[PDB]
Design a protein around this ligand. Structure first.
Ligand SMILES: Cc1nc(C)c(C(=O)Nc2ccc(F)c(-c3nc4ncc(-c5ncccc5C)cn4n3)c2)o1
Ligand SMILES: *[B]([O])([O])[C]([C][C]([C])[C])[N]C(=O)[C]([C]C1=[C][C]=[C][C]=[C]1)[N]C(=O)C1=[C]N=[C][C]=N1
Lengths: 230, 235, 218, 206, 229, 214, 204, 201, 238
């Protein structure tokens, strides 16, 4: 009825549907995965190209927020670019005012309050996006996920997207304590080529990015020849 | 009716209030414009409500400058504030550039006002509805005689022969023939008054319509008198 | 806190820029151990003559502009001619707000062959040359830099452009009050900007006309 | 201050006189400029000052009395209500952005009963004013350089029971003293009068 | 930002939103007050939802200045906007006249806050009434505002649940020359006859404005009165 | 600290029958020093037929050259690619100098271009925009040397002799070199090298010339 | 100065069950007399009478804002304003405009109708409250009035003999001040009546 | 600058010089000190060169916008009141302009004068500028209301000349206009040096 | 369908219909084909044919700066509000840095301009698509924005009414675009544009706008006179 038309309406049992309807925009989106590898964090996503003529590098869902942190989004691409352009502004404030790099748990708590502030007012709609904050600050390697409700949580590994239930069981076979960033790019990319089917889309490729001690604590994308072929 | 909004799209891609404003142009008086290499003629029926109206009070043709005229169709209360805006813009051009504003840039200065409408003000106070008037701007400049149309969509389009209003669909069939690109101005006179005779419901008299031209070699706007409009009929 | 004179010159292949490592406060020389040569990005470097607090806030602003344009987007790094242009428009904006950046600056930069050398004032003046000097090096050291660029129009090598800077830094120690004998030289080449370890120059104070009995006023 | 305004009230009239000189630092532009603005049919004001603020103050006062007669169905307000509206515009302008009006003025009027229920003033009204916002009801008021010559003249010769002709030959003595001692050439004085039948422009005394 | 009004007229000609708010302002606990020749008593009823809710912490008799007090019955958090605006408007009177406010002028000011939200854009009316009482330069007062903004000048009244049968008990017990100690004797006695259990010193809260001052009675001074009635 | 500073130099132009010669020396200098000898920031191109040639303060010169640069671009975008004439640019100049009347530019301007007929006309401006079409014009520190010199040899006044024929591009150029070799001798803030611009209907050609270095 | 532009001195003395207040009659522009019959006193009710001195443009503008605020006080509060409430009211008015200040110096005299206590108050132009129990005085001849009032006052005066001291203090101080004079207008006031007297003075 | 203009039986004649000096240096010698507002009005120039050329171009814009909206010509009593309200609004901004407006409306002639301080006066005889004090004594000696068209053109051209000859801030080329009922015509345009060997051969 | 009225209303399946309704405006505009080469980007827009003699003109292709240009499809009244924003932000760049704005920065700036208008209640999406034709230090670029806020980096694309057939033609030649010269690169764009036309019309200089940006070539719109060198000899062969 009229109990699911905006954000400032609790249900008869205390639920907000426009937040929960925004969570179905992430569950119908492409598959995301991540891993914390005891000296860094590796994040991989699958770009579903809708045409053969797209340039390699188009629609990259991984964006660098600071030198040590970067947010990969899962859900709607243009809604997540408002989250990226906000968390960059949160990370520029700590460098310019407090003369310090932003911590991993503090950048994620600023993302979860920007995403929550658009779920409490009638004129605004929640994001169709789950943001994955991968950071390496002076509190070690961090891996956070902010859902459209504004809930942040530290993870060791995460699967998000359509086949987030099959890819979650594929993460339970990894270690995360002896796991390094050297092997996990080959492992996490091999999750995506097994969890995802080619009988719906013909064009699908993977985009991996890390931040670890080997890359001098810098959030970078891959050199193109480290990813497995298929 | 308030179930929809003012910015609500249709499933076919159209905006509701803009598509509903184009239909308000078809329920108005008709108007003409014919681009000819000697000038542009702007014929328009007046469509008086009664015989007790003095005809010099409801002029469908308004001057913007000495070289730009403007004829409207639809509701004429919205038509005044667009022409009152185009007069301010075309005199600020002479104030700044010491030269007459081009006919294109006077149409662009009007279309920028015909798009500024919404429902949430905030910083700026916006209009509540689009303008229910389609203007039709003519004039001469360094590129010669030009004809332009502002629609309520905000879409400006340069033309050669365009009719707006109620008698516009029938005139486009008459526009297909009976128009070559190197007519004379006096041949453009008798073309417009024959179209405006066909597409109107009343008897065409000199005190019934309005005809105004902007000549190329003169460069100035020349509106007509009822003794001048009669001389076009008897040809 | 205020900086002293900064001199710079082009040679065959790159640009050199020298400055004393002193930060005076009026006449008092408070700190002889601060570096004034800041380098910008990966191809350029700037140094200032004047207020240090204005330079420390301005160079903090234009260093954040180089990285965030490069980090966020898939674009190249700004050339030296484009980050000097942002440096020029930011100083002119401050004097129109009646709060200027009260210092002269010297800017160097080399991007793949194209060498760049320019200066900027607190007002907004900008100029490009093969020899820039600010402060009292514009009076003292700049005439010596100008004759050595016109005694060979083919260009200076690095070896002979380093001899004449040392000849200019030596006279800046003789004739400027607010100066010390500890200098750093930036070297912007095709490899990038490289700041050297602080050195000193050999001064001669042993003239026979400087003795006690000649200069006496009896 | 170079031009004088002289006004005195009597039993059934108020004389005003204002020299019609307009100058440019020593050059006589005019000699006959009317400086006594007819506000209402029974009210007038004799402003002195330079010609910039003098027109722009009187046009703001006159158009607001007329507006207050439009909105109130042609009911003429009293002379004290006009005078208190005037000094509100002087006093609010000395503490504003644009600055103070440099006008010195003498308000004059005659109070008539507007209806049978009106039991207010019947007699004449004459108000001294200033550029700051001072307001004072006074038997006679004077501005300009020649004010002190003629205020002590009216200390000698003014009487409350002067007639229309006896006050007419008093104003002639008031105009001949300013021609005698003031270095500023005031030759034409624009004498007007407010009586029970409205205002009237006296041709004789000049 | 929803600048339209929420309270409008009905086809019967009644503000139906304020009619609902008077139902909300009558579902609170029983608060009451009586006057006398020497002072004015106000009496409340602190209903504890459990035995673990710190009965010394919650309060219903609100003191506004050195001469005014108040007690509500309705929505609790809606009342705190009214008391914080009444404590603020009473300090602005002393910074401008160097005088305690009269009870008339304070109640005119808080009635302009009820009516403000019944004609504003995007808000609902208040759901609570008050019992303002205190002294000024012309005797003793006991007023009672409504969520409509309509204020009164009562002499003995009651608000809340069990109010129409406690206000009828005030008609039968009031006398024109009641003293102050006689007023407290009957203000506590009209609480008991509608009270559920056994009222204690931590269970009710009274405040009797005396001679210049409101002075909410303590737990020892109110214990003196319970074992006397 | 004072936010105004004169940076020397001079600009002179002489307009012919279908051309203008536009010149300005390349010399930047400050308080008592000499900043540069090769500043090309004294004459600015707005359209292919109309230049601006300003001097005075170098900092407010570069700001005025950019606001003139984009008002031409908003003219070109809003008029269907039509390039503005000299008369349109020079009235744009005359208004923008008055919009900043109370915190003005310390520039002294010349708008130099061709007519719609093809003849060349130079304009001149004060600090607040007083314009006039005229056949020549000289601004800068050495204006009082050259502007009486251009009165004596272009107008041909106070000389009881018949008029010479019309000046060519070459006889105008060799004349204008005699002024800058005359301003380099007697003005201390003028002269390292002067750059001549020759604006004709078939594009513009550019020359240089050497003055005294002291 | 701007404060002594218009001229005029207002003072007040306190008695047993009465007080007096007295102003001069001169208005001027720094040397020249504009009017000779202008008091400086204002009466708002049967208990409070106050007098303004300073710049005459501010003497009329401030007294319009006081009458705007005193009559609005009587509509809101159904009562006459008291002396302690009136003096603390226009103390606050001179403090709101502290950087654009009014050039008045109000001299407030008041009395309780039922009790009989007098209350004097003389603020500065910036609103400095000051309540002496003996006398207050402001104006251009204020330095001459502190000598006249202090050498002649005693606490226990009758209303008929307090007028004789205040009248000889105003006139003897205005014979030394060239910006005040031309007679004086006084007002004695008790619990029972208000009597307004005009006093002979030098016409110099 | 020695602009004058007078009103007589037959219309209004405006007469100016053409010299602009920034102190002791003469900036120009061909300055048009009459901005024609439209084909029936005139405006004159004195004082600041940019302050006059800006606000009489603003005045020429408000007169053109009058004819567009109201369909008829503007009067001169409305035209100066536009210029006087602009001028009085900026009286503390240090403007320096003294301008006469002259034209033929439907009520005959009218010759006004606007300061830089908001004044507006109505006479038939003015002379404005730094050298105007020289142009009064030769004009007030020979002025009368019923002059002919040729003699009043001669009196105006001769009254400019005796002020250009004496004032250092005046001179150049004396321009004489004539405002009749059909508009204005440029009567003559001649050098001051050529005009010396006519009046004193 | 009660979840399609407002812009700030998610469906119970997780769709935004007001954004999906503005996407139909782009699919109803005129067909335009962008083709990127090795150093050149060629835009080929299909403007309106004359009605048997009278020629209506409506400007679609816009110049943004010396190195940028775009062609619109859909609501042309929103395509000029974008043209005001893109031209202003390229003047503000070249004022500061004295060089042309890079295309990867600019494509990220259009996407945040579409994004401010798709989350507030009293705002609406721009019902217009773009085709950026850019050149910078990184070489030629070809972008395309949609009313959702996406921005896609293409090798070749086509938007407009019946532009699916032009896209089918480009999906056979897009591997051979880094090898052709400029004269062949215009020819692949015009053969693609001719397959989106009606059943009985072919291309000429009267209905086609050709815009080319290059490495030593600023953004040049080839209209009526100069466009004849690529359009007089042209035939859509099967
Ligand atoms: C009705 C009437 N009667 C008269 C006698 C006037 C009158 O004179 N009004 C007037 C008003 C404003 C002005 F601004 C001016 C005015 N004219 C000038 N001409 C030249 C210079 C100048 N030139 C070069 C160097 C130095 C100077 C000082 C200065 N001014 N100032 C003149 O009006
Ligand atoms: B006339 O002599 O006043 C004439 C005024 C006319 C051109 C409108 N010009 C000037 O003499 C003025 C003098 C002046 C008056 C007030 C302030 C400053 C100067 N000269 C200029 O305004 C001038 C100066 N430099 C260049 C151009 N014009």
């Amino acid at each position: 009825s009229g109990h699911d038309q905006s954000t400032d309406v609790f249900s008869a049992e205390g639920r907000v549907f426009q937040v929960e309807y925004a969570g179905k925009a992430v569950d119908n989106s492409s598959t995301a995965v991540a891993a914390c590898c005891k000296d860094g964090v590796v994040v991989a996503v699958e770009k579903v190209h809708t045409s053969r003529m797209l340039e390699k590098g188009s629609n990259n869902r991984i964006h660098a927020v600071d030198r040590q942190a970067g947010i990969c989004i899962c859900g709607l691409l243009p809604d997540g670019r408002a989250i990226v352009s906000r968390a960059r502004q949160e990370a520029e404030n700590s460098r310019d005012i407090f003369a310090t790099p932003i911590r991993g748990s503090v950048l994620a708590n600023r993302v979860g309050e920007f995403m929550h502030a658009y779920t409490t007012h009638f004129a605004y709609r929640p994001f169709g996006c789950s943001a994955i904050i991968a950071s390496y600050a002076d509190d070690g390697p961090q891996l956070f996920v902010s859902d459209p409700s504004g809930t942040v949580a530290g993870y060791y590994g995460v699967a998000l997207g359509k086949a987030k239930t099959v890819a979650k069981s594929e993460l339970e076979k990894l270690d995360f304590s002896s796991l390094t960033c050297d092997e996990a790019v080959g492992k996490l990319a091999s999750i995506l080529h097994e969890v995802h089917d080619k009988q719906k889309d013909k064009l699908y490729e993977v985009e991996v990015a890390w931040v670890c001690d080997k890359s001098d604590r810098k959030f970078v994308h891959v050199p193109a020849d480290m990813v497995p072929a298929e | 009716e308030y179930d929809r909004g003012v910015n609500t799209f249709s499933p076919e891609g159209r905006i509701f209030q803009i598509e509903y404003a184009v239909e308000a142009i078809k329920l108005g008086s008709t108007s003409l414009g014919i681009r000819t290499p000697e000038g542009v003629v702007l014929a328009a029926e007046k469509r008086v409500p009664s015989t007790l109206v003095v005809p010099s009070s409801m002029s469908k043709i308004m001057e913007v400058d000495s070289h730009i005229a403007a004829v409207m169709s639809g509701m004429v209360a919205d038509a005044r504030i667009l022409v009152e805006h185009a007069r301010v813009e075309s005199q600020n051009h002479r104030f700044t550039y010491n030269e007459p504003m081009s006919v294109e840039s006077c149409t662009l200065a009007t279309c920028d006002l015909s798009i500024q409408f919404g429902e949430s003000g905030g910083r700026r106070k916006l209009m509540s509805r689009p303008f229910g008037v389609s203007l039709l701007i003519a004039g001469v400049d360094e590129k010669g005689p030009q004809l332009w149309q502002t629609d309520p969509s905000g879409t400006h389009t340069r033309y050669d022969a365009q009719a707006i209003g109620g008698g516009a669909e029938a005139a486009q069939s008459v526009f297909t023939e009976r128009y070559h690109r190197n007519m004379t101005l006096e041949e453009g006179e008798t073309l417009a008054v024959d179209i405006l005779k066909q597409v109107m419901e009343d008897q065409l008299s000199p005190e019934n319509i309005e005809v105004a031209v902007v000549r190329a070699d003169d460069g100035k706007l020349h509106m007509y008198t009822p003794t001048e409009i009669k001389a076009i009929m008897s040809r | 806190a205020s900086g002293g004179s900064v001199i710079a010159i082009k040679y065959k292949g790159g640009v050199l820029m020298a400055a004393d490592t002193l930060l005076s406060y009026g006449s008092l020389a408070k700190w002889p151990n601060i570096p004034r040569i800041r380098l910008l990005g990966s191809h350029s470097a700037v140094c200032a003559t004047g207020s240090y607090a204005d330079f420390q806030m301005m160079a903090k602003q234009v260093e954040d502009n180089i990285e965030r344009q490069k980090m966020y987007h898939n674009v190249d790094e700004l050339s030296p001619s484009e980050v000097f242009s942002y440096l020029h428009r930011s100083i002119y904006q401050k004097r129109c707000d009646f709060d200027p950046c009260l210092c002269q600056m010297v800017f160097i930069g080399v991007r793949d062959g194209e060498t760049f050398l320019a200066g900027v004032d607190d007002v907004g003046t900008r100029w490009e040359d093969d020899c820039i000097a600010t402060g009292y090096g514009a009076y003292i050291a700049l005439p010596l830099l100008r004759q050595a660029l016109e005694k060979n129009p083919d260009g200076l090598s690095r070896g002979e452009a380093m001899r004449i800077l040392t000849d200019c830094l030596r006279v800046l120690f003789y004739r400027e009050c607010r100066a010390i004998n500890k200098f750093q030289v930036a070297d912007a080449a095709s490899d990038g900007v490289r700041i050297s370890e602080p050195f000193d120059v050999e001064t001669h104070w042993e003239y026979e006309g400087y003795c006690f009995e000649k200069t006496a006023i009896i | 201050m170079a031009e004088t305004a002289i006004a005195f009230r009597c039993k059934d009239y108020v004389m005003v006189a204002a020299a019609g000189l307009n100058a440019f630092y020593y050059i006589k532009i005019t000699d006959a400029e009317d400086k006594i603005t007819q506000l209402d049919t029974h009210q007038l004001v004799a402003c002195t000052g330079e010609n910039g603020p003098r027109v722009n103050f009187t046009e703001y006062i006159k158009c607001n009395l007329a507006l207050n007669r439009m909105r109130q169905h042609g009911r003429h307000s009293s002379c004290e209500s006009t005078a208190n509206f005037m000094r509100n515009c002087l006093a609010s302008a000395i503490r504003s952005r644009e600055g103070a009006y440099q006008v010195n003025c003498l308000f004059a009027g005659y109070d008539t009963p507007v209806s049978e229920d009106d039991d207010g003033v019947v007699g004449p009204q004459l108000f001294y004013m200033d550029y700051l916002g001072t307001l004072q009801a006074v038997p006679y008021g004077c501005h300009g350089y020649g004010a002190c010559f003629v205020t002590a003249l009216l200390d000698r010769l003014w009487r409350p029971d002067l007639s229309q002709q006896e006050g007419l030959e008093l104003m002639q003595k008031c105009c001949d003293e300013v021609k005698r001692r003031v270095i500023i050439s005031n030759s034409y004085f624009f004498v007007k009068a407010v009586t029970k039948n409205g205002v009237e422009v006296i041709t004789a005394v000049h | 930002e929803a600048f339209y009004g929420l309270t409008t007229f009905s086809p019967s000609g009644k503000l139906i939103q304020i009619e609902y708010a008077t139902t909300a302002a009558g579902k609170g606990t029983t608060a009451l007050g009586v006057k006398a020749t020497d002072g004015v008593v106000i009496a409340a009823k602190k209903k504890a939802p459990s035995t673990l809710v710190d009965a010394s912490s919650i309060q219903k008799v609100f003191v506004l200045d050195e001469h005014v007090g108040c007690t509500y019955s309705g929505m609790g958090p809606d009342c705190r906007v009214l008391i914080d605006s009444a404590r603020k408007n009473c300090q602005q009177y002393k910074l401008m006249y160097n005088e305690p406010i009269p009870i008339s002028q304070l109640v005119r000011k808080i009635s302009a806050i009820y009516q403000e939200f019944t004609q504003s854009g995007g808000v609902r009316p208040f759901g609570c009434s008050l019992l303002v009482a205190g002294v000024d330069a012309n005797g003793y007062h006991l007023y009672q505002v409504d969520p409509s903004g309509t204020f009164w000048a009562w002499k003995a009244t009651a608000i809340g649940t069990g109010s129409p049968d406690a206000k009828a008990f005030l008609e039968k017990r009031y006398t024109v020359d009641m003293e102050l100690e006689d007023a407290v004797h009957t203000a506590l006695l009209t609480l008991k006859e509608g009270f559920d259990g056994q009222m204690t010193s931590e269970n009710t809260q009274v405040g009797r404005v005396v001679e210049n001052r409101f002075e909410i009675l303590s737990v020892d001074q109110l214990r003196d009165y319970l074992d006397q009635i | 600290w004072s936010p105004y500073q004169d940076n020397g130099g001079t600009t002179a132009a002489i307009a012919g029958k279908d051309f203008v010669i536009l010149a300005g020396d390349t010399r930047l200098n400050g308080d008592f020093c000499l900043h540069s000898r090769h500043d090309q920031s004294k004459i600015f191109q707005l359209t292919p037929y109309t230049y601006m040639a300003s001097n005075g303060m170098q900092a407010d010169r570069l700001q005025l050259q950019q606001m003139l640069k984009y008002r031409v671009k908003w003219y070109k975008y809003n008029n269907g690619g039509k390039v503005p004439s000299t008369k349109a640019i020079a009235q744009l100049m005359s208004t923008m100098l008055y919009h900043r009347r109370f915190f003005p530019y310390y520039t002294f301007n010349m708008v130099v271009g061709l007519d719609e007929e093809g003849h060349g006309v130079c304009y001149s401006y004060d600090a607040v925009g007083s314009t006039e079409p005229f056949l020549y014009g000289t601004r800068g520190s050495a204006a009082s040397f050259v502007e009486p010199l251009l009165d004596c040899l272009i107008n041909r006044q106070h000389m009881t002799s018949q008029a010479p024929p019309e000046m060519t591009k070459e006889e105008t150029l060799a004349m204008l070199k005699n002024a800058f070799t005359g301003a380099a001798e007697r003005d201390i803030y003028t002269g390292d090298s002067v750059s001549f611009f020759i604006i004709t209907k078939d594009g513009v050609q550019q020359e240089s010339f050497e003055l005294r270095k002291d | 100065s701007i404060m002594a532009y218009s001229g005029g001195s207002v003072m007040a003395m306190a008695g047993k069950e009465c007080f007096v207040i007295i102003s001069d009659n001169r208005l001027g522009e720094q040397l020249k007399t504009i009017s000779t019959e202008v008091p400086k006193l204002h009466v708002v009710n049967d208990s409070i009478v106050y007098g303004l001195t300073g710049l005459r443009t501010d003497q009329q503008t401030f007294a319009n804002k006081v009458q705007f605020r005193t009559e609005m006080y009587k509509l809101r509060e159904e009562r006459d304003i008291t002396g302690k409430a009136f003096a603390a009211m226009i103390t606050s008015m001179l403090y709101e405009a502290r950087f654009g200040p009014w050039f008045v110096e109000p001299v407030i005299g008041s009395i309780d109708k039922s009790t009989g206590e007098v209350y004097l108050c003389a603020t500065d132009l910036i609103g400095a409250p000051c309540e002496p129990e003996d006398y207050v005085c402001a104006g251009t001849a204020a330095e001459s009035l502190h000598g006249m009032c202090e050498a002649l006052w005693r606490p226990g005066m009758s209303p008929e003999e307090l007028f004789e001291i205040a009248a000889q203090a105003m006139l003897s101080a205005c014979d030394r001040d060239s910006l005040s004079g031309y007679g004086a207008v006084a007002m004695i006031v008790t619990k029972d009546k208000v009597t307004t007297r005009l006093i002979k003075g030098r016409k110099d | 600058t020695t602009t004058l203009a007078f009103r007589f039986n037959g219309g209004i004649i405006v007469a100016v010089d053409s010299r602009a000096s920034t102190g002791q240096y003469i900036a120009s010698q061909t300055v048009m000190k009459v901005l024609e507002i439209n084909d029936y009005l005139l405006g004159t120039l004195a004082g600041g060169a940019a302050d006059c050329q800006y606000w009489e171009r603003v005045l020429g814009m408000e007169c053109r916008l009058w004819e567009l909206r109201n369909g008829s010509r503007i009067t001169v009593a409305a035209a100066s009141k536009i210029l006087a309200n602009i001028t009085y609004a900026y009286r503390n901004h240090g403007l320096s302009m003294g301008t006469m407006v002259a034209g033929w409306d439907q009520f005959g002639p009218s010759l006004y004068y606007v300061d830089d301080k908001g004044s507006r006066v109505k006479q038939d005889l003015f002379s404005v500028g730094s050298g105007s004090i020289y142009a009064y004594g030769v004009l007030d000696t020979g002025y009368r209301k019923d002059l002919s068209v040729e003699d009043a053109c001669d009196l105006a051209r001769r009254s400019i000349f005796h002020a250009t000859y004496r004032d250092g801030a005046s001179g150049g080329i004396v321009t004489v206009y004539h405002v009749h009922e059909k508009g204005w015509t440029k009567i003559s345009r001649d050098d001051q040096t050529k005009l010396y060997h006519r009046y004193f051969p | 369908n009660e979840y399609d009225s407002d812009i700030t209303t998610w469906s119970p399946t997780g769709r935004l219909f007001q954004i999906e309704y503005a996407n139909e405006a782009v699919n109803n505009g005129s067909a335009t084909v962008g083709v990127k080469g090795k150093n050149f980007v060629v835009l080929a827009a299909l403007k309106r044919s004359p009605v048997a003699e009278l020629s209506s003109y409506q400007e679609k292709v816009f110049e943004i700066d010396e190195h940028v240009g775009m062609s619109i499809s859909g609501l042309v009244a929103d395509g000029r509000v974008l043209a005001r924003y893109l031209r202003t932000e390229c003047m503000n760049y070249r004022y500061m840095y004295s060089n042309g704005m890079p295309m990867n920065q600019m494509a990220d700036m259009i996407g945040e301009k579409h994004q401010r208008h798709i989350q507030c209640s009293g705002k609406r999406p721009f019902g217009v698509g773009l085709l950026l034709a850019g050149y910078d230090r990184q070489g030629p670029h070809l972008y395309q924005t949609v009313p959702s806020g996406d921005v896609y980096d293409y090798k070749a694309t086509a938007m407009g009414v019946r532009s699916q057939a032009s896209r089918t033609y480009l999906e056979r030649h897009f591997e051979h675009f880094s090898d052709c010269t400029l004269d062949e690169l215009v020819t692949h764009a015009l053969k693609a544009l001719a397959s989106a036309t009606s059943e009985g019309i072919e291309l000429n200089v009267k209905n086609t706008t050709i815009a080319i940006v290059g490495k030593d070539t600023p953004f040049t719109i080839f209209e009526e006179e100069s466009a004849r060198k690529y359009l007089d000899g042209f035939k859509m062969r099967p």
